[PDB]
């Protein structure tokens, strides 16, 4: 059971690392998407590269 506890702590660390990395990365993706859909939600089409 102590070996199980050690492996469980390892698994906690793995889950926390995965959750951190994914949440940060996709939060910055959220920010980028917000910037696109705010400043240029097809405002490029209004520009149309005319």
């Amino acid at each position: 059971l102590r070996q199980r506890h050690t492996e469980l702590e390892r698994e906690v660390s793995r889950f926390e690392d995965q959750t951190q990395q994914q949440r940060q990365q996709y939060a910055q993706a959220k920010e980028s998407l917000t910037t696109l859909n705010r400043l240029i939600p097809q405002v490029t089409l209004l520009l149309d590269e005319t």
Binding site: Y26, Q28, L36, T44
Partner: protein, 49 residues
């Protein structure tokens, strides 16, 4: 800021992909949370044992 020159000529696909990646955000965060707390409960059970 994201990409360096990144298909600014027609970027809508990228907005769609980022929406998909936000769906992935939700899925991944919920899955990680549920798994880690269930295995925390397993930890508690092992502790009592």
């Amino acid at each position: 800021r994201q990409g360096r020159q990144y298909q600014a000529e027609d970027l809508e696909a990228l907005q769609n992909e980022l929406e998909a990646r936000q769906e992935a955000l939700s899925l991944s965060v919920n899955e990680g949370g549920e798994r880690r707390m269930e295995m925390r409960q397993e930890l508690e059970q092992l502790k009592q044992k």
